[PDB]
Design a protein around this ligand. Structure first.
Ligand code: HEM
Length: 289
């Protein structure tokens, strides 16, 4: 399958900066969500789950088609909780009805990372909504109870290598787990994008415990948690080296995360040679807004 990016008619940087700014202003305004974490983390997770359905083998799934708007995908058990992000984006969709659904979902994740003081993430427009029958079946997103070999194999389907996997997982610094969504609980209330996932992995005293859903997770006394798949990144010697690298170099982590996250959000999309260059949006803070 080929999905060619098609720029929303007549739109340019300034139009998408306006959408970014509306998302960013709403992030600031609706600060109470999830015990004052705000919507940033769930928007990052939404952007990832709408992209992470991709299969490199046949170009099914992926962000292009905006298929999360359809019930089969909306109701994937793996997506429990993301409805909160969707609801956040509804007024944005209403104000800017011209932006495609995949563009909106992916731009929500970019805006969230940047407004949380993360790296700049270049972003390209032109995803085009596709019909309900193009929605991927449930079961393409990863399980959390597994080991490093599972993680490694899983991410090959998304064309991600060890460095890209470890970099992407650093998003688990953000937000928290919720027992009712995933069968995992805790992790704090962080809404600042940092390399602390890696520092916490290396420096905390982790205990393997059973949570109230009878699933195993690693807990620290300071309130952080690691999923089994997170902890696998320090069990496997190749992953461990990269964890150490990112724990010791904030800038390197930022740069690698930015590349991997853009790639994730763009998997499956063919950009014409004369497509616009990727946009780098200014934060509200940079604009004095
Ligand atoms: C092996 C891969 C991964 C597994 C198994 C996994 C699993 C999970 C689980 C179980 C939760 C808790 C959901 C809930 O209870 O609300 C979660 C949260 C989260 N995940 Fe992942 N994840 C993975 C990779 C990623 C990647 C690649 C990103 C993005 C780059 C990401 C971003 C997030 C964020 C931001 C949250 C917090 C959401 C919130 O606070 O509402 N995850 N993930």
């Amino acid at each position: 399958l080929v999905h060619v990016a098609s720029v929303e008619k007549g739109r340019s940087y300034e139009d998408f900066q306006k959408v970014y700014n509306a998302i960013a202003l709403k992030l600031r305004e609706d600060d109470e969500y999830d015990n004052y974490i705000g919507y940033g983390p769930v928007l990052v997770r939404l952007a990832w789950h709408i992209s992470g359905t991709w299969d490199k083998h046949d170009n099914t799934g992926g962000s292009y088609g905006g298929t999360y708007r359809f019930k089969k995908e909306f109701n994937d058990p793996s997506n429990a909780g993301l409805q909160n992000g969707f609801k956040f984006l509804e007024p944005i969709h209403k104000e800017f009805p011209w932006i495609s659904s995949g563009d909106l979902f992916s731009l929500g994740g970019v805006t969230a990372v940047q407004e949380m003081q993360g790296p700049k993430i270049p972003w390209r427009c032109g995803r085009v909504d596709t019909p309900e029958d193009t929605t991927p079946d449930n079961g393409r997103l990863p399980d959390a109870d597994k080991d490093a070999g599972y993680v490694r194999t899983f991410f090959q389907r998304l064309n991600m290598n060890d460095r890209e996997v470890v970099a992407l997982m650093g998003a688990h610094a953000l937000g928290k787990t919720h027992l009712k969504n995933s069968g995992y609980e805790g992790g704090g209330a962080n809404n600042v994008f940092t390399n602390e996932f890696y520092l916490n992995l290396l420096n905390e005293d982790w205990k393997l415990e059973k949570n109230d859903a009878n699933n195993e997770q690693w807990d620290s006394k300071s309130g952080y948690m690691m999923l089994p798949t997170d902890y696998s990144l320090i069990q496997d010697p190749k992953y461990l080296s990269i964890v150490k690298e990112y724990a010791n170099d904030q800038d390197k982590f930022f740069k690698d995360f930015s590349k991997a996250f853009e790639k994730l959000l763009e998997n499956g999309i063919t950009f014409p040679k004369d497509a616009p260059s990727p946009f780098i949006f200014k934060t509200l803070e940079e604009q004095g807004l």
